[PDB]
Structures are given as structure tokens and as C-alpha cells.
Amino acid sequence: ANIVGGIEYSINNASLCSVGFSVTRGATKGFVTAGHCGTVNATARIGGAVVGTFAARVFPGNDRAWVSLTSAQTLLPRVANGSSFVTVRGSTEAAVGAAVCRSGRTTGYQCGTITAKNVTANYAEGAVRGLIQGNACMGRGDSGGSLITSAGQAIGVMSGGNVQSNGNNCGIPASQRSSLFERLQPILSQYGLSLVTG
Numbered sequence: 001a002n003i004v005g006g007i008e009y010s011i012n013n014a015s016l017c018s019v020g021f022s023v024t025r026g027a028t029k030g031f032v033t034a035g036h037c038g039t040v041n042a043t044a045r046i047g048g049a050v051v052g053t054f055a056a057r058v059f060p061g062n063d064r065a066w067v068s069l070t071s072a073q074t075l076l077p078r079v080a081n082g083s084s085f086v087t088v089r090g091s092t093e094a095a096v097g098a099a100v101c102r103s104g105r106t107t108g109y110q111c112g113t114i115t116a117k118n119v120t121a122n123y124a125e126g127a128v129r130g131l132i133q134g135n136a137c138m139g140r141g142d143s144g145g146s147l148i149t150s151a152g153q154a155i156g157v158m159s160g161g162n163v164q165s166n167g168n169n170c171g172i173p174a175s176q177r178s179s180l181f182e183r184l185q186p187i188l189s190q191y192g193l194s195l196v197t198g
Contacts, residue, residue, distance in 0.1 A: 006103025104142030139168025
């Protein structure tokens with residue numbers, strides 16, 4: 001399969017999430033995603049076909065994971081944007097007020113600004129510390145997906161948000177949206193991963 005940020009994958013043939021970013025660990029191909037998306041050894045599928053397994057995850061506390069992929073998979077330095085894409089050029093931190101976009105399988109490509117840093121999410125499952133908050137909308141299934149700038153800098157992966165009864169927070173004013181992201185760099189560092197760039 002082509003590995004691109006934002007695309008759908010399934011876990012245990014039971015649940016859905018979004019790819020974060022293509023990465024390598026030496027010769028091993030992978031993608032980063034959210035920790036709450038899977039458990040260690042859980043099977044990932046794209047288009048209903050096995051592509052790899054969860055190699056490692058942390059959730060709660062943090063919310064991060066990576067999926068180790070078969071060598072047949074095709075890593076692309078890309079984030080999906082409708083029928084187009086955005087090329088991943090590198091990674092950076094992002095400051096309050098920065099323009100960003102996220103990509104995922106439920107609400108697609110949505111843009112907004114960073115509204116806060118160092119946010120704790122009191123999820124029912126447990127607290128997650130250190131999150132970036134933005135006002136781009138999201139919905140159930142967008143978790144794990146890319147957070148990037150339009151210029152191609154990878155910033156994070158989606159952790160969660162204030163989803164409403166319709167399954168997203170696109171229907172409420174931007175001022176009321178809390179969309180939350182795990183910073184990318186600690187993921188790459190913890191797991192010895194290199195971001196695939198173009």
C-alpha cells in the first residue's frame with residue numbers, strides 16, 4: 001500500500017484510525033500514529049489487507065505509537081489533502097498562533113491555528129499531558145492523523161478533541177473547538193525513528 005499521512009487504517013479488523021507520518025527505523029518501514037489507536041502486536045490493515053503491526057505505544061500519560069510495516073509497503077513523504085497532497089519536508093515545533101492543518105479519514109483535511117500548548121486532556125481512559133491544542137475541526141476516526149503546516153513541516157499527530165453528538169466538532173464555532181495533538185519530536189526520539197521527507 002502507499003503510506004500517506006491522513007489515510008484510513010483499521011486495527012484488529014475492529015476499529016479505525018488515521019496514519020500520522022511515514023517513518024523508518026533503520027531498514028524497517030513504519031508509520032507514527034496515536035497510542036490509543038492500538039495495543040502492542042495489534043494488526044494494522046489498509047484496504048482490508050494486512051500491512052503491519054503495532055510495534056510500541058504509550059497511552060495514557062502520553063498518546064503515541066508506531067506501526068512496523070512489511071517491506072512491501074511504499075513509504076511516501078506525503079500528507080493527504082483531498083485529491084492532492086502536501087509534501088513532508090521536515091519537522092518543527094509550533095508556537096501559539098501558528099497556522100496548521102490536520103488530515104484524517106473522518107473529516108479530511110482541516111485547517112486552523114494553534115491555540116494552546118502543554119494541555120492535559122482528562123480523557124475517560126486516563127489523563128494525557130503535554131498536548132498541543134488547535135481549533136481545526138476533527139471527528140471520531142481522525143485520531144492518529146497528521147498535523148502539518150501548509151509549507152510541509154510535520155508538527156504532531158492527532159490525539160483527541162471535543163467530539164459532539166454528530167461525531168465531530170465541525171458543527172460548533174471554532175472558538176469552542178478543542179482539537180488535541182501529541183508533539184511529533186518526542187515520538188521520533190523515543191522510538192529511534194526518522195521522518196520520511198521529500
